[PDB]
Motif scaffolding. Structure first.
Motif, PDB file in Angstrom:
ATOM      1  N   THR A 118      32.523  43.706  49.030  1.00 27.71           N
ATOM      2  CA  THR A 118      32.822  42.668  48.042  1.00 27.71           C
ATOM      3  C   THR A 118      31.609  41.774  47.785  1.00 27.71           C
TER       4      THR A 118
ATOM      5  N   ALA B  42      41.657  43.681  42.076  1.00 30.58           N
ATOM      6  CA  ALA B  42      40.662  42.616  42.123  1.00 30.58           C
ATOM      7  C   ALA B  42      39.261  43.159  42.354  1.00 30.58           C
ATOM      8  N   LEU B  46      35.974  43.124  39.765  1.00 33.73           N
ATOM      9  CA  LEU B  46      34.680  42.590  40.187  1.00 33.73           C
ATOM     10  C   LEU B  46      33.565  43.599  39.907  1.00 33.73           C
ATOM     11  N   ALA B  73      39.764  36.890  41.622  1.00 35.82           N
ATOM     12  CA  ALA B  73      38.660  37.726  41.144  1.00 35.82           C
ATOM     13  C   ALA B  73      38.306  37.429  39.694  1.00 35.82           C
TER      14      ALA B  73
END
Ligand SMILES: O=C(O)c1c(C[C@H]2c3ccccc3C[C@H]2O)ccc2c1OCO2
Ligand SMILES: O=C(O)c1c(C[C@H]2c3ccccc3C[C@H]2O)ccc2c1OCO2
Ligand SMILES: [Cl-]
Ligand SMILES: [Cl-]
Lengths: 148, 148
Positions: A118, B42, B46, B73
């Motif tokens: 992430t 999410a 991204l 997000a």
């Protein structure tokens, strides 16, 4: 020139970050993988080539250059696989600077994310949107000009 | 608009294929996931927003619309989250047709790949390069025109 990409592999938290840089723009895509294998590299290149018009890839090392799986993916996707030897000697330093830059951004966001992958995608976002025009704007303009 | 994307979720081989379609061009990105969770959605958004200038996302269902992780997000990446209700019903049919088209391409390549995710990325490649201009050419032109 609009179709030239460079592979780059860097390490963080005992994991591997695989990066593809669009050389003319500085635009990147990146993924976290357990380790750099031909298999992972091949899959990453397939993903990249379905998303942008990848004509040439300068591979990051001799193992991926030699890999029959990487060669198979490059054949499938219509990519010319070349070495990534910096005959232009400002290439080593430019990649180096980007890895440092990317790791810096990763550090700035690391706390906001539970998982490294992430934080890496956040870093890709920030890098591609950073106005220097941004890399994202430059890649689009370069390829559009090339199509017209 | 150059920044409008639509989320689409379809099923194959007991797995989920998450798709983002750039509405004006027909260009897609896709991933295989175990199941559609807020978390996966999410993360996918991204990734997408770091790669293309995503302004608005029409979410595929109410669960992802409601999801606090998806909302987080979208906030992070500067994305306006909207519903994906086909107020024009030539929208729902267009997605249907694409899912069928994508599954057809997946079937045409499925044998060449050991893993479904590879076949899906091959299908993304074929879809985005197919001249009808290709979707890949159209998205680049739309966004370039928008920048300049
Ligand atoms: O077989 C797979 O699915 C697979 C492959 C090889 C395939 C492949 C991959 C890319 C392009 C053509 C082809 C044809 C085929 O060689 C490589 C890496 C992977 C894979 O799965 C995850 O990472
Ligand atoms: O925490 C994670 O790493 C994580 C998250 C949440 C994070 C996230 C994700 C995207 C954007 C901002 C933020 C901030 C933060 O909320 C979601 C989904 C994931 C994640 O890991 C894999 O799929
Ligand atoms: Cl961007
Ligand atoms: Cl393309």
């Amino acid at each position: 020139s609009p179709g030239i990409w460079q592979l780059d592999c860097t390490h963080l938290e005992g994991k591997v970050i695989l990066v593809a840089v669009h050389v003319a723009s500085g635009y990147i895509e990146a993924e976290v993988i357990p380790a750099e294998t031909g298999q992972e590299t091949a899959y990453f290149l397939l993903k990249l080539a379905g998303r942008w018009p990848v004509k040439t890839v300068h591979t990051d090392n001799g193992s991926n250059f030699t890999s029959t799986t990487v060669k198979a993916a490059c054949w499938w996707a219509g990519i010319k696989q070349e070495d990534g030897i910096p005959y232009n000697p400002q290439s080593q330093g430019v990649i180096e600077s980007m890895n440092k830059e990317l790791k810096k951004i990763i550090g700035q966001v690391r706390d906001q994310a539970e998982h490294l992958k992430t934080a890496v995608q956040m870093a890709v976002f920030i890098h591609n949107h950073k106005r220097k025009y941004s890399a994202g704007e430059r890649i689009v303009d370069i390829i559009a000009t090339d199509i017209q």
